[PDB]
Design a protein around this ligand. Structure first.
Ligand SMILES: Nc1ncnc2c1ncn2[C@@H]1O[C@H](COP(=O)(O)OP(=O)(O)OP(=O)(O)O)[C@@H](O)[C@H]1O
Ligand SMILES: Nc1ncnc2c1ncn2[C@@H]1O[C@H](COP(=O)(O)OP(=O)(O)OP(=O)(O)O)[C@@H](O)[C@H]1O
Ligand SMILES: [Mg+2]
Ligand SMILES: [Mg+2]
Lengths: 483, 379
């Protein structure tokens, strides 16, 4: 047959369509699912392995940088609340929802994972019954319904399509008796990412916690405390509940304790450093490593002022150690193959490059034509105050600025280059040389905005950057500030 | 432990002929069945209400107490015997709203027999014709509407079900519960009051040997949780949080309810947010809100531009740069005074850009920076 179009790259999974409600004849026909070899969890790692032919030189700051990587001193009350709710709901065989919200990097996922680890340790001591832990991250899903595919695959071991998985989970949570079940603890991380238009997924996940036979713990980690009030309906907000756990950004003393806990064994300690290569061994010269308490304190105070984000504090300390290690390796010439201190200067330089703006020094290093464009644009904003200027007006005002300051030395040397490219055989041009080039360059830089128009004269252009930093970059130039 | 079982009873997933504080509505719903199974007349019932009012709980209570798969017996007011088939279906947990007829058929037919393929009104209408009463309870009937389409096609499935529960030569009685001459009967479930919530709580904890709450604490929790448009789920979480707060420190007193209602309300308090700021950060906050006053859709760059010109008009507190301006804006967003969002312009150049907005009351702002009483003209 002759097709009207073709779909030649269809990749379909081997997922069955029949839900769990048709797996046995009756409710009484359902066996004990705990004594089943595929329920409740009853190969790629070696492809990224090779043989090492050299000996990596780990310098003395490499252990500091390794210990400062992201891979519970400040979360006691949050840990205790989450653990007590989960322990009470597991040991009494009930279903509940715990809500956790906070800004990035305040220890939400780490605290919930530690709670789950301690509950698994308590279930290994036969103090609470066994449970299955499932982690669903909404930003790791391709489609939002794939969470239905994930959770059911973690429960039964089957692979169904998402609608059949949703019916299977509904039948499982509602109809299967508690004597044939295991408790499930589900972490719904990045809860805002699973919010869709119809909000059926959110309703189903929080409504399964209201069923009497469910034995389901849903720990929902969010980014805002008012997500059910802003984005969800009244039905899902009623099911989530009034009790919500806020993870506040860290104060500077807790960030100080976090950084000291990552460096408890390294700070104020001695290393055997081999001066031939640079390789350092933690307990040939005996060198003491030190990072200043003033440096850690000022980085922690800065980070707690900004966000209270532990990732940022660890990254600022790691960047300071990297800067100091770069200077040390440069001054000794070591390569990769008596007191070494990472100081408050390195911490301030790590804190400054994140706060430095390149926009002004980008604009001060442009050519004369791009600066002339920006200067004429600012002149037109001063003349009429419209904040959007047509490109033809910019052309006319560039021409005006050339013919008005014609007695200037630099302008009377630049005019032949601008309008004829220094050639007698080239006619006088309506645009300057490199007009399109500097227009497109300022558009790709994000300095400029241009409307989608086909007439080149009446097309409007807007500053995307702030006006005063453009004026500062214009007054930096010698020629433009004199005319 | 008494604390564990009391915490178990006050979950949203705990069950308990009539529920407490609902018996009259129970009788109303029962009166529906007291006709429908009596005269073999197909009829349709609509139930509304705000969330947590006991619709699903009372219907499941009725199904578990007083009632080819899922066949059982029901007694009328005279009460001889009657063969009934009772199921319950949540409409949101289905794939498509058009398959619900098939779902009803997969809720009724014996698994050993021939499983037919069902599309619409007609095949279900032909299937129930040789028969025995069929009780269907459909939770969330409103999500049976199609959120797309229009008014003509969103009310296809619901009108089809209402017509199929109204015509003769079948025995189809339909109960539908949504949230708040053949039109359905309506009982509005009402939000609970403080006395109703109190009686529900003592009825639920009557299975417990002791009561580890003072009754004044339950009454205070009920009167704060009821208000207007109350939900019993909120009262359950308040009492459960009181137990958790009590055992995280060590009968439950009056104070622990207030400790719950101080722990889980944000307590915005713009004055104490402002008092944690610096004088420079207060100056940037004043310039930001003045820029929002006079521009009404201002990006961060125009706000910084206004800040530069406004504090060069004063010639005190020498100015800072744009990136550290954004840094103090981030401090203000961390404090809870400023929201930065990513939106589109309304100009000829429509592109994305970062916009700045406030969520603070003007009276506390103006009072707290007139109490500063040195740097005036930014207010
Ligand atoms: N209390 C802490 N003690 C030690 N390290 C911590 C602590 N809190 C956070 N960290 C570090 O910061 C990292 C970020 O924490 P986490 O993943 O829990 O953040 P989050 O709140 O879930 O953030 P996001 O919303 O971005 O996912 C942790 O992996 C850990 O390296
Ligand atoms: N009168 C009552 N006695 C005992 N428990 C009750 C009573 N009313 C409600 N509950 C409990 O309240 C919770 C929610 O009740 P239910 O599911 O019936 O609410 P609903 O009105 O259907 O709400 P929604 O619109 O949110 O679905 C359940 O735990 C239920 O046991
Ligand atoms: Mg996280
Ligand atoms: Mg309900």
């Amino acid at each position: 047959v002759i097709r009207k179009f073709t779909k030649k790259n269809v990749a379909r999974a081997k997922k069955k369509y029949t839900p769990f409600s048709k797996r046995f004849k009756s409710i009484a026909a359902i066996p004990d699912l705990t004594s089943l070899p595929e329920f409740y969890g009853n190969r790629f790692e070696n492809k990224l392995k090779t043989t090492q032919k050299h000996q990596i030189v780990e310098t003395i700051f490499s252990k500091v940088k390794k210990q400062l990587n992201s891979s519970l001193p400040a979360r006691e009350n949050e840990f205790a609340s989450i653990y007590l709710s989960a322990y009470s709901a597991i040991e009494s065989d009930s279903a509940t929802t715990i809500y956790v919200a906070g800004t990035p990097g305040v220890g939400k996922t780490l605290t919930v994972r530690e709670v789950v680890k301690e509950l698994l340790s308590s279930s290994a001591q036969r103090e609470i019954p066994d449970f299955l832990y499932v982690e669903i991250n909404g930003l790791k899903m391709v489609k939002p319904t794939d969470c239905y595919e994930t959770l059911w695959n973690k429960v039964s071991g089957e692979r169904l399509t998402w609608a059949a998985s949703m019916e299977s989970l509904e039948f499982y949570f509602k109809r299967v008796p508690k004597n044939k079940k295991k408790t499930i603890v589900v972490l719904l991380d990045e809860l805002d990412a699973m919010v869709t238009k119809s909000q059926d997924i959110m309703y189903n996940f929080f409504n399964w916690t209201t069923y009497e036979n469910a034995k389901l713990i849903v720990i929902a980690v969010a980014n805002t405390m008012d997500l059910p009030e802003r984005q969800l309906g009244n039905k899902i907000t009623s099911r989530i509940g009034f009790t919500r756990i806020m993870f506040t950004g860290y104060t500077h003393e807790e960030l100080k304790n976090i950084i000291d806990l990552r460096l408890k064994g390294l700070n104020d300690s001695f290393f055997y450093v081999d001066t031939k290569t640079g390789n350092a061994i933690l307990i040939v010269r005996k060198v003491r490593l030190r990072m200043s308490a003033d440096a850690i304190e000022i980085a922690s105070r800065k980070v707690a002022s900004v966000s209270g984000d532990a990732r940022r504090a660890l990254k600022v300390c790691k960047r300071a150690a990297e800067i100091a290690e770069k200077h040390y390796m440069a001054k000794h010439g070591y390569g990769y193959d008596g007191v070494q201190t990472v100081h408050i200067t390195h911490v301030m330089k790590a804190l400054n490059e994140t706060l430095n703006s390149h926009v002004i020094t980008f604009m001060t290093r442009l050519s004369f034509t791009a600066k002339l464009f920006i200067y004429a644009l600012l002149n037109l904003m001063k003349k009429n105050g419209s904040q959007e200027q047509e490109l033809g007006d910019i052309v006319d005002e560039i021409k005006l600025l050339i013919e008005v300051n014609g007695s200037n030395k630099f302008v009377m040397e630049i005019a032949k280059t601008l309008f004829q490219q220094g050639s007698d055989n080239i006619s006088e041009q309506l645009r300057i040389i490199s007009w399109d080039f500097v227009l497109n360059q300022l558009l790709d830089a994000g300095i400029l905005f241009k409307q989608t128009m086909k007439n080149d004269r009446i097309c409007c252009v807007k500053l995307n950057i702030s006006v005063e930093e453009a004026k500062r970059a214009m007054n930096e130039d010698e020629t433009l500030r004199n005319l | 432990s008494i604390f564990l079982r009391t915490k178990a009873l006050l979950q949203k997933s705990s069950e308990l002929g009539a529920l407490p504080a609902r018996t009259a509505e129970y009788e109303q719903v029962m009166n529906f069945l007291a006709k429908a199974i009596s005269e073999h007349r197909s009829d349709s019932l609509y139930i509304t209400g705000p969330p947590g009012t006991g619709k699903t709980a009372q219907l499941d209570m009725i199904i578990r107490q007083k009632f080819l798969q899922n066949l059982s017996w029901f007694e009328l007011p005279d009460g001889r015997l009657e063969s009934v088939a009772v199921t319950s279906i949540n409409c949101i947990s289905l794939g498509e709203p058009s398959s619900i007829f098939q779902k009803i058929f997969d809720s009724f037919q014996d698994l050993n027999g021939p499983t037919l393929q069902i599309k619409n009104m007609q095949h279900l209408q032909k299937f129930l014709e040789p028969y025995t009463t069929f009780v269907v309870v459909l939770d969330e009937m409103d999500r049976l509407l199609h959120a797309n389409t229009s008014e003509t096609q969103s009310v296809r499935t619901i009108l089809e079900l209402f017509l199929l529960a109204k015509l003769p030569t079948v025995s189809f009685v339909l109960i539908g519960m949504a949230n708040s001459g053949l039109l359905p009967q309506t009982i509005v479930f009402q939000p609970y009051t403080a006395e109703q919530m109190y009686e529900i709580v003592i009825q639920k904890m009557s299975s417990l040997p002791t009561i580890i709450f003072q009754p004044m604490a339950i009454k205070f929790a009920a009167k704060k949780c009821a208000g207007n448009t109350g939900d019993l789920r909120k009262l359950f979480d308040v009492l459960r949080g009181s137990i958790e707060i009590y055992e995280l420190e060590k009968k439950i007193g009056l104070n622990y309810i207030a400790k719950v209602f101080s722990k889980f309300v944000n307590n915005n308090s713009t004055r104490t947010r402002i008092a944690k700021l610096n004088i420079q950060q207060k100056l940037i906050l004043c310039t930001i809100i003045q820029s929002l006053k006079l521009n009404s859709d201002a990006t961060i760059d125009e706000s910084f531009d206004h800040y530069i010109k406004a504090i060069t008009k004063t010639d005190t507190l020498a100015p800072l740069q744009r990136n550290e301006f954004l840094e103090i804006c981030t401090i203000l967003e961390t404090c809870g005074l400023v929201s930065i969002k990513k939106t589109k312009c309304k100009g000829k150049t429509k592109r994305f850009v970062d916009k700045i907005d406030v969520d603070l009351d003007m009276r506390e702002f103006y009072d707290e920076m007139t109490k500063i009483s040195i740097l005036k003209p930014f207010l």
